[PDB]
Design a protein around this ligand. Structure first.
Ligand SMILES: [Fe+3]
Ligand SMILES: [Fe+3]
Lengths: 200, 196
């Protein structure tokens, strides 16, 4: 699901309320997220059926071309993001024991984890993304920031993406304006911990 | 305290909304002032804004730089605009002949501005600069908190259009182009020309 050009929203536009308004999901998904799709079609000139999304993201902005990469990267990223949140009446809010043991090993308990995430996620300067990753080189969880359209996948340095929080101002500005931390504290309550564990 | 707004919050309507000027200026712009003080541990009296900007993030340190650059960039941003009631003024004759020299007329400049300002990916800024090395007007984009002042090669900033989404999101959402063509009517040519 997480791969693939044209991912359908796995839920309604208001299913993230009251953390992220219907208005925000509407613009984020139907404007930003779709815009990137056309954008990638226009920049490759390829038909949908010929585009391998992850392959472009790993290829990188140099080999793929800045604008092919920014588009593809943004699609992969936005894919991961919608998948990272549980709607109202979804499931996935509970931490599978497997992932839970790993997070306790890194940070002690989830409270400590949230606190490092808030620290790193508020400080990220500019347009970017926050990722929980599993570091394969080091066999441990970690929190990583990437800029613009970059990712653990495009950095291709052994870090496997588990979840992502969009930190571009378009992700929260309608709802929280300058107050990214307010957005972040509440986006935590949305995490699909199941999905995260499944990327292990 | 670097700085004060020339107009009231509503002075840029209908291009930019009172709400956007309030958040942009009172939370965003002003907020970096208290970030700068802390990151440097210095008082207002002991901080030279341009000094830290031209130092860059390696010399000044990442947070000092990001903050000082944003106070400078925003200082330029507000002064690059005039109230919509003051719109439509002639570009001073000295600036105009430089514009024509470069792009034929202003309309062709504007088209170049739209192309560059619409393509900048992520957060950043669009500047009109005098290119000392090249003896001519130019339009450039810089990323995040960077600026022609940061670059320090020889490009003098004449005006800036803020292109971070906070600049336009409440009014135009994803539609940056829409923000861009209308922002153009607000350009403070007096300021721009005065910056040569
Ligand atoms: Fe986004
Ligand atoms: Fe700004």
């Amino acid at each position: 699901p997480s791969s693939g050009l044209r991912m359908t929203l796995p839920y309604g536009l208001e299913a993230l309320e009251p953390v992220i308004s219907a208005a925000t999901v509407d613009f984020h998904y139907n404007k930003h997220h779709q815009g990137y799709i056309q954008k990638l079609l226009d920049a490759t000139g390829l038909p949908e059926s010929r585009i391998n999304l992850k392959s472009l993201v790993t290829l990188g902005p140099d080999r793929a071309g800045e604008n092919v990469f920014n588009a593809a990267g943004q699609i992969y990223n936005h894919n991961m993001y919608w998948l990272s949140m549980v709607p109202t009446s979804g499931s996935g809010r509970h931490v599978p024991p497997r992932l839970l043991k790993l997070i306790r090993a890194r940070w002690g308990n989830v409270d400590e984890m949230k606190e490092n995430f808030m620290r790193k996620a508020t400080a990220l300067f500019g347009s970017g993304w926050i990722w929980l990753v599993w570091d394969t080189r080091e066999r441990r969880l970690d929190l990583v920031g990437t800029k613009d359209a970059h990712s653990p996948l495009s950095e291709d340095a052994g870090k496997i993406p588990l979840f992502t929080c969009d930190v571009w101002e378009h992700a929260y500005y309608l709802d929280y304006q300058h107050d990214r931390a307010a957005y972040l504290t509440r986006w935590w309550s949305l995490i699909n911990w199941e999905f995260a564990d499944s990327n292990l």
